[PDB]
Amino acid sequence: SQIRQNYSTEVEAAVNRLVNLYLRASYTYLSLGFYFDRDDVALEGVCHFFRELAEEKREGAERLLKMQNQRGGRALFQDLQKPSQDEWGTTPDAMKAAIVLEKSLNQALLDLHALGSAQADPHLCDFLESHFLDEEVKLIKKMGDHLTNIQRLVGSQAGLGEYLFERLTL
Amino acid sequence: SQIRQNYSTEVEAAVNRLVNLYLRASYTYLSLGFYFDRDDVALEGVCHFFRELAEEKREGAERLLKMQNQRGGRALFQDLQKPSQDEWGTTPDAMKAAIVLEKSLNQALLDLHALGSAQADPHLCDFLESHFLDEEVKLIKKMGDHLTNIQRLVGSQAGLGEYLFERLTL
Amino acid sequence: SQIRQNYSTEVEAAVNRLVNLYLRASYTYLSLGFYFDRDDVALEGVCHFFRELAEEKREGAERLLKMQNQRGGRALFQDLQKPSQDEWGTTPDAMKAAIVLEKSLNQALLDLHALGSAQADPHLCDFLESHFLDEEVKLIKKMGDHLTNIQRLVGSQAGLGEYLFERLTL
Amino acid sequence: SQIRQNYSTEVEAAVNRLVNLYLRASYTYLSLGFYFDRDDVALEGVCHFFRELAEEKREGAERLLKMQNQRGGRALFQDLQKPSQDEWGTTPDAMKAAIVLEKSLNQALLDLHALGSAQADPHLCDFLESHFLDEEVKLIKKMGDHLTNIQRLVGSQAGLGEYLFERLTL
Amino acid sequence: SQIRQNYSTEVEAAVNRLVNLYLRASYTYLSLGFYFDRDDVALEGVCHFFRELAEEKREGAERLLKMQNQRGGRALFQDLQKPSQDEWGTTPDAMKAAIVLEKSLNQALLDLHALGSAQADPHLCDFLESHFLDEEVKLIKKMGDHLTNIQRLVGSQAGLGEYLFERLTL
Ligand SMILES: [Cl-]
Ligand SMILES: [Cl-]
Ligand SMILES: [Cl-]
Ligand SMILES: [Cl-]
Ligand SMILES: [Cl-]
Ligand SMILES: [Cl-]
Ligand SMILES: [Cl-]
Ligand SMILES: [Cl-]
Ligand SMILES: [Cl-]
Ligand SMILES: [Cl-]
């Protein structure tokens, strides 16, 4: 506020909402990871994949929080809703759910960018472009590649396919 | 006996019984290992898995024997009964038998801990907690994870599954 | 007291008493050590053995004092009674006296652990198990081993035996 | 059996019996070792000597088991009889018992070699010569050397002698 | 002949015959190796396995030739018969043929050893034991292990099995 300049109340609010979305995505990935660590699921590669994503989404949230402070905005936290499932099914089910989650995060980033462009807030626009937009695109391409490979394998002989994917890709 | 302090005859006996159980488990794993080294079985990863467990159970027994002496108890050895099978079937059969064995060792440890708590023998209780209880829990989780993976694979195409498990997990 | 939680007045008092016992044991070992450094006794290995024990018991007391503060207890010091003997006789006399001392420390630890269990103070119980109970058991076994060796030698030819023990074991 | 060639049923059986003998010898040495670790015996060198022999006999058994599989024989395990004594007396008693044990193992090896020669099984004959016959001869010479030294010392002043042997030879 | 001592004409002849057998086995493995290098077979691991065996059998022959000269025997060479097949079928066909070949070499070694024992030629007997008998036993066990693994895989889905064996074992 002594520092705040060209930073709309609308962007400040939307940044707080995006923080909650990223933290919720982190929580979802935490749940996905520990599900694949269950003794009756036991796919270590899959567990590690989602646990790494939990960390990445938490880091995204922290970078948004840092930015909020840099611009003189005020962080406001809300409840983090529990993930949508207690059990996540097969690796394919999980990967499909993960792409859905990422596409919603990406649309939120795109919406925030559009708001920034409308508010003529180029720092916001740059911030998103530099740390979030390309990272999301890259992650969604990777998930799509994984989905294709999982699906190719899970004809057959689905158990064999899920094992091989976890062993040879993840 | 010049050193013996707070060490009941009941615990001393139960420690000797647990030594026999661990040595018997070592012997069982010795048999499992060499079975998987047979030219008509030939699963090296499986052989190495059980041979390593033979060594771990022998080391467990030696640590119990050391403790028995540290407390002024007297080691008493009994016959080691031969393992329950001469041939161990498939990798899954073997892993199922191994989890049964471990759960019996774990229950023996839990029983000994309960005896120690009842005799107010905190050194015994600590000893078990520090060297045995978490090791057993970790080993049983690993075996459960292996069982799940074996079972996933041994739909199909059981021969293919047993080969892949041995090559890619073990 | 701003920090104090689940820490009974009974345990706090017993911890202060155990500090005094450990400091007294340190003092006793200080006296034992310097006795064996006398020109008319002159058993350097024996002197070093007890001087090292003096240091270990002092360190035990300091760890109890640190814990007392960590839990929000208040250290209260009492007089340290002088050791029970001015002259300690033979190496065997000294080692017998040392095992008596250790067994009393061990019983004090066991008593404090029982108090902690009754007060449902698991931090205390863990603290004792981790730093004191196994250390005492190990030390008492060592002393017992030394006693046996001394006694074996001090048939004969007692002077020869006391010399050889000091030279070849200590 | 796809691999088995020039390997008689008689040799296969005798190899299984020799495995049991070696494992039993390992168990005996385990008992001897822990006896000398007792606080009322306390001869560390003696304990280490027998504990090392326990390991060597176990390794002998494992090499026989490996060979059995290499030749297409089938390992069959029997109960391991408990050692013949619960308490082993003096170092001399123990060493005398150890030479008795070794001479029985050596005679078993010699008997198996004679069977191999009669069955015209030169691989067996070589196997024994290369890993077992000279090792046994060397070990029996060492034990004989130790026996002589113990006996020389245990005139006197037996306690002094047992101490010095343990300190200066073992 | 200035050097020849205790070396029968019968052993000298049998050594020359064994040289021819080893060279023929080398030639067979040369053919097996290049068959698996064909563009319409294309199993590199299988090719390398047999090419390495070609080299080992050639080295065996050279060691027999060296020995023949050391004993004052005279090397006599015969035609090397072409291998029994121009095309070797599947990996399993090839491995079955290889075990047949090895068992014939092993029986030749055993026969030569029996001749040496009958002629009281212990140098020959030692020579065979040290460089040939255990090597053959080890190689036949390995081939048997490979055969079992191939057979396990070549249910299914034989093409998949042959590929996986070559990729993951060889
Ligand atoms: Cl991880
Ligand atoms: Cl930046
Ligand atoms: Cl191994
Ligand atoms: Cl420990
Ligand atoms: Cl000192
Ligand atoms: Cl601590
Ligand atoms: Cl040792
Ligand atoms: Cl060897
Ligand atoms: Cl090559
Ligand atoms: Cl040579």
Side-chain angles (χ1 to χ4, degrees):
Chain A
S1 172
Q2 71 189 334
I3 67 168
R4 192 175 184 145
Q5 184 171 29
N6 197 40
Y7 193 63
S8 64
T9 58
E10 291 87 359
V11 166
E12 176 187 15
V15 167
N16 284 325
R17 292 197 286 275
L18 195 60
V19 169
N20 186 265
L21 283 187
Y22 268 74
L23 291 176
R24 197 196 165 179
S26 186
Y27 201 17
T28 292
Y29 288 133
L30 179 66
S31 176
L32 274 155
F34 278 95
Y35 167 81
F36 286 95
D37 178 62
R38 291 173 43 167
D39 80 275
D40 63 355
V41 177
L43 291 163
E44 184 178 325
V46 187
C47 172
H48 185 76
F49 176 81
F50 289 124
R51 284 199 64 183
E52 293 179 318
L53 288 174
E55 164 177 347
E56 295 309 289
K57 296 306 162 180
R58 185 187 62 249
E59 289 165 357
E62 288 167 357
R63 175 176 325 260
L64 284 157
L65 288 165
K66 178 172 172 171
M67 184 270 285
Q68 182 75 293
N69 280 348
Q70 286 172 311
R71 295 296 302 274
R74 288 303 169 250
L76 288 182
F77 294 100
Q78 299 300 155
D79 297 344
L80 297 188
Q81 293 300 311
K82 78 179 187 182
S84 63
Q85 298 181 220
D86 297 332
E87 300 184 333
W88 297 95
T90 63
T91 301
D93 290 327
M95 198 68 64
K96 286 183 178 157
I99 304 169
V100 171
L101 187 51
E102 294 304 325
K103 292 173 115 199
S104 75
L105 286 179
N106 201 33
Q107 189 63 58
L109 292 172
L110 292 178
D111 295 342
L112 183 54
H113 185 106
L115 180 68
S117 318
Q119 296 289 332
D121 191 337
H123 177 276
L124 174 72
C125 288
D126 178 60
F127 172 83
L128 294 177
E129 289 167 1
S130 297
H131 308 295
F132 289 84
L133 299 185
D134 194 35
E135 162 186 282
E136 258 332 287
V137 156
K138 287 165 177 145
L139 177 61
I140 294 165
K141 174 62 164 63
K142 182 174 273 201
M143 291 181 172
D145 292 350
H146 290 341
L147 207 72
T148 292
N149 279 286
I150 296 163
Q151 294 169 315
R152 187 184 270 129
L153 282 164
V154 302
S156 313
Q157 320 194 334
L160 176 64
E162 194 170 15
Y163 180 78
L164 289 172
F165 184 75
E166 182 267 339
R167 290 284 92 184
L168 299 178
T169 297
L170 293 178
Chain B
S1 172
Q2 71 189 334
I3 67 168
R4 192 175 184 145
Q5 184 171 29
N6 197 40
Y7 193 63
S8 64
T9 58
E10 291 87 359
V11 166
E12 176 187 15
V15 167
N16 284 325
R17 292 197 286 275
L18 195 60
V19 169
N20 186 265
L21 283 187
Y22 268 74
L23 291 176
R24 197 196 165 179
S26 186
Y27 201 17
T28 292
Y29 288 133
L30 179 66
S31 176
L32 274 155
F34 278 95
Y35 167 81
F36 286 95
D37 178 62
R38 291 173 43 167
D39 80 275
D40 63 355
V41 177
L43 291 163
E44 184 178 325
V46 187
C47 172
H48 185 76
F49 176 81
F50 289 124
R51 284 199 64 183
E52 293 179 318
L53 288 174
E55 164 177 347
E56 295 309 289
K57 296 306 162 180
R58 185 187 62 249
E59 289 165 357
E62 288 167 357
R63 175 176 325 260
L64 284 157
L65 288 165
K66 178 172 172 171
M67 184 270 285
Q68 182 75 293
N69 280 348
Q70 286 172 311
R71 295 296 302 274
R74 288 303 169 250
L76 288 182
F77 294 100
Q78 299 300 155
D79 297 344
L80 297 188
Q81 293 300 311
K82 78 179 187 182
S84 63
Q85 298 181 220
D86 297 332
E87 300 184 333
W88 297 95
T90 63
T91 301
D93 290 327
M95 198 68 64
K96 286 183 178 157
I99 304 169
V100 171
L101 187 51
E102 294 304 325
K103 292 173 115 199
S104 75
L105 286 179
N106 201 33
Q107 189 63 58
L109 292 172
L110 292 178
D111 295 342
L112 183 54
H113 185 106
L115 180 68
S117 318
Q119 296 289 332
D121 191 337
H123 177 276
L124 174 72
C125 288
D126 178 60
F127 172 83
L128 294 177
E129 289 167 1
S130 297
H131 308 295
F132 289 84
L133 299 185
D134 194 35
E135 162 186 282
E136 258 332 287
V137 156
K138 287 165 177 145
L139 177 61
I140 294 165
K141 174 62 164 63
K142 182 174 273 201
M143 291 181 172
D145 292 350
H146 290 341
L147 207 72
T148 292
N149 279 286
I150 296 163
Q151 294 169 315
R152 187 184 270 129
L153 282 164
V154 302
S156 313
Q157 320 194 334
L160 176 64
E162 194 170 15
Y163 180 78
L164 289 172
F165 184 75
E166 182 267 339
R167 290 284 92 184
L168 299 178
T169 297
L170 293 178
Chain C
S1 172
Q2 71 189 334
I3 67 168
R4 192 175 184 145
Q5 184 171 29
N6 197 40
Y7 193 63
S8 64
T9 58
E10 291 87 359
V11 166
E12 176 187 15
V15 167
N16 284 325
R17 292 197 286 275
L18 195 60
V19 169
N20 186 265
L21 283 187
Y22 268 74
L23 291 176
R24 197 196 165 179
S26 186
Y27 201 17
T28 292
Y29 288 133
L30 179 66
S31 176
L32 274 155
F34 278 95
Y35 167 81
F36 286 95
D37 178 62
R38 291 173 43 167
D39 80 275
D40 63 355
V41 177
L43 291 163
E44 184 178 325
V46 187
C47 172
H48 185 76
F49 176 81
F50 289 124
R51 284 199 64 183
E52 293 179 318
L53 288 174
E55 164 177 347
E56 295 309 289
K57 296 306 162 180
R58 185 187 62 249
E59 289 165 357
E62 288 167 357
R63 175 176 325 260
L64 284 157
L65 288 165
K66 178 172 172 171
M67 184 270 285
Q68 182 75 293
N69 280 348
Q70 286 172 311
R71 295 296 302 274
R74 288 303 169 250
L76 288 182
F77 294 100
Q78 299 300 155
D79 297 344
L80 297 188
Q81 293 300 311
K82 78 179 187 182
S84 63
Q85 298 181 220
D86 297 332
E87 300 184 333
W88 297 95
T90 63
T91 301
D93 290 327
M95 198 68 64
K96 286 183 178 157
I99 304 169
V100 171
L101 187 51
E102 294 304 325
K103 292 173 115 199
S104 75
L105 286 179
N106 201 33
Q107 189 63 58
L109 292 172
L110 292 178
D111 295 342
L112 183 54
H113 185 106
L115 180 68
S117 318
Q119 296 289 332
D121 191 337
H123 177 276
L124 174 72
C125 288
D126 178 60
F127 172 83
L128 294 177
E129 289 167 1
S130 297
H131 308 295
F132 289 84
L133 299 185
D134 194 35
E135 162 186 282
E136 258 332 287
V137 156
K138 287 165 177 145
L139 177 61
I140 294 165
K141 174 62 164 63
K142 182 174 273 201
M143 291 181 172
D145 292 350
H146 290 341
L147 207 72
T148 292
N149 279 286
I150 296 163
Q151 294 169 315
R152 187 184 270 129
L153 282 164
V154 302
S156 313
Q157 320 194 334
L160 176 64
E162 194 170 15
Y163 180 78
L164 289 172
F165 184 75
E166 182 267 339
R167 290 284 92 184
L168 299 178
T169 297
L170 293 178
Chain D
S1 172
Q2 71 189 334
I3 67 168
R4 192 175 184 145
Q5 184 171 29
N6 197 40
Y7 193 63
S8 64
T9 58
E10 291 87 359
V11 166
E12 176 187 15
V15 167
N16 284 325
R17 292 197 286 275
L18 195 60
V19 169
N20 186 265
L21 283 187
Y22 268 74
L23 291 176
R24 197 196 165 179
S26 186
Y27 201 17
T28 292
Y29 288 133
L30 179 66
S31 176
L32 274 155
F34 278 95
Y35 167 81
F36 286 95
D37 178 62
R38 291 173 43 167
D39 80 275
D40 63 355
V41 177
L43 291 163
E44 184 178 325
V46 187
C47 172
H48 185 76
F49 176 81
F50 289 124
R51 284 199 64 183
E52 293 179 318
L53 288 174
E55 164 177 347
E56 295 309 289
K57 296 306 162 180
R58 185 187 62 249
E59 289 165 357
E62 288 167 357
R63 175 176 325 260
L64 284 157
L65 288 165
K66 178 172 172 171
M67 184 270 285
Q68 182 75 293
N69 280 348
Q70 286 172 311
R71 295 296 302 274
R74 288 303 169 250
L76 288 182
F77 294 100
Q78 299 300 155
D79 297 344
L80 297 188
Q81 293 300 311
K82 78 179 187 182
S84 63
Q85 298 181 220
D86 297 332
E87 300 184 333
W88 297 95
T90 63
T91 301
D93 290 327
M95 198 68 64
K96 286 183 178 157
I99 304 169
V100 171
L101 187 51
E102 294 304 325
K103 292 173 115 199
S104 75
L105 286 179
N106 201 33
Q107 189 63 58
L109 292 172
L110 292 178
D111 295 342
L112 183 54
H113 185 106
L115 180 68
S117 318
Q119 296 289 332
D121 191 337
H123 177 276
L124 174 72
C125 288
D126 178 60
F127 172 83
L128 294 177
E129 289 167 1
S130 297
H131 308 295
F132 289 84
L133 299 185
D134 194 35
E135 162 186 282
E136 258 332 287
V137 156
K138 287 165 177 145
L139 177 61
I140 294 165
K141 174 62 164 63
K142 182 174 273 201
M143 291 181 172
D145 292 350
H146 290 341
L147 207 72
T148 292
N149 279 286
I150 296 163
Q151 294 169 315
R152 187 184 270 129
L153 282 164
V154 302
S156 313
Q157 320 194 334
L160 176 64
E162 194 170 15
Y163 180 78
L164 289 172
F165 184 75
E166 182 267 339
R167 290 284 92 184
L168 299 178
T169 297
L170 293 178
Chain E
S1 172
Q2 71 189 334
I3 67 168
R4 192 175 184 145
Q5 184 171 29
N6 197 40
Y7 193 63
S8 64
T9 58
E10 291 87 359
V11 166
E12 176 187 15
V15 167
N16 284 325
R17 292 197 286 275
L18 195 60
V19 169
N20 186 265
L21 283 187
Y22 268 74
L23 291 176
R24 197 196 165 179
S26 186
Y27 201 17
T28 292
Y29 288 133
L30 179 66
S31 176
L32 274 155
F34 278 95
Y35 167 81
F36 286 95
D37 178 62
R38 291 173 43 167
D39 80 275
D40 63 355
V41 177
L43 291 163
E44 184 178 325
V46 187
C47 172
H48 185 76
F49 176 81
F50 289 124
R51 284 199 64 183
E52 293 179 318
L53 288 174
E55 164 177 347
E56 295 309 289
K57 296 306 162 180
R58 185 187 62 249
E59 289 165 357
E62 288 167 357
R63 175 176 325 260
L64 284 157
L65 288 165
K66 178 172 172 171
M67 184 270 285
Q68 182 75 293
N69 280 348
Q70 286 172 311
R71 295 296 302 274
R74 288 303 169 250
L76 288 182
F77 294 100
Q78 299 300 155
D79 297 344
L80 297 188
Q81 293 300 311
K82 78 179 187 182
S84 63
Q85 298 181 220
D86 297 332
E87 300 184 333
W88 297 95
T90 63
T91 301
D93 290 327
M95 198 68 64
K96 286 183 178 157
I99 304 169
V100 171
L101 187 51
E102 294 304 325
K103 292 173 115 199
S104 75
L105 286 179
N106 201 33
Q107 189 63 58
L109 292 172
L110 292 178
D111 295 342
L112 183 54
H113 185 106
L115 180 68
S117 318
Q119 296 289 332
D121 191 337
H123 177 276
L124 174 72
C125 288
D126 178 60
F127 172 83
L128 294 177
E129 289 167 1
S130 297
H131 308 295
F132 289 84
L133 299 185
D134 194 35
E135 162 186 282
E136 258 332 287
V137 156
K138 287 165 177 145
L139 177 61
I140 294 165
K141 174 62 164 63
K142 182 174 273 201
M143 291 181 172
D145 292 350
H146 290 341
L147 207 72
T148 292
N149 279 286
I150 296 163
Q151 294 169 315
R152 187 184 270 129
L153 282 164
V154 302
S156 313
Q157 320 194 334
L160 176 64
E162 194 170 15
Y163 180 78
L164 289 172
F165 184 75
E166 182 267 339
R167 290 284 92 184
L168 299 178
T169 297
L170 293 178

